[PDB]
Design a protein around this ligand. Structure first.
Ligand code: HEM
Length: 153
């Protein structure tokens, strides 16, 4: 599992993300969309935005970045005991949104990059390793639920 010490590192960085969720979630989604254009085609509501400027300008995109980080936050503060939060998310993303497990790996890279941009002194190699472990556990448990449903990535 993650140690209690690695959970400390994780949550101490997330409490700073919580100071500007809407700004963090907007950077993250933007980085996802640009590095991996195919993910944007998953979103009928966003599929019109072609440039970075248009993305930055959208209130609705910012609303959805708040949705995602809040749900991730709920999960991270359960330190592993996240079965009840995670189960509905796997079901919707499997059966309704149809999101490949690989795209969950892409947004995981985006979160880590943005956390490093916005919080260097605070997000050293050690906190980087703890956060990547916590995201892998997230991916790992959703992937198990996908397999059960017949979607396995
Ligand atoms: C940490 C990653 C993610 C979290 C915590 C997360 C969380 C959520 C939540 C809470 C919702 C709204 C309720 C739901 O539909 O069940 C949602 C909706 C959605 N998510 Fe995810 N999501 C994540 C990653 C992704 C990725 C990587 C994609 C696409 C590449 C994606 C695409 C969508 C779409 C299409 C919706 C619905 C948007 C709309 O209202 O039309 N999600 N997600």
């Amino acid at each position: 599992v993650l140690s209690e010490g690695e959970w400390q590192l994780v949550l101490h960085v997330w409490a700073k993300v919580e100071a500007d969720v809407a700004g963090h979630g907007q950077d993250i989604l933007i980085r996802l969309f640009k590095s991996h254009p195919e993910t944007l085609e998953k979103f009928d509501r966003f599929k019109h935005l072609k440039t970075e400027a248009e993305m930055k300008a959208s209130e609705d995109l910012k609303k959805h970045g708040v949705t995602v980080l809040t749900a991730l936050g709920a999960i991270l503060k359960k330190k592993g005991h996240h079965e009840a939060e995670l189960k509905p998310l796997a079901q919707s993303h499997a059966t309704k949104h149809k999101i490949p497990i690989k795209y969950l790996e892409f947004i995981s890279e985006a979160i880590i990059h943005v956390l490093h941009s916005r919080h260097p002194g605070d997000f050293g190699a050690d906190a980087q390793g703890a956060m990547n472990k916590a995201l892998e556990l997230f991916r790992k448990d959703i992937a198990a639920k996908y397999k059960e449903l017949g979607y396995q990535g």
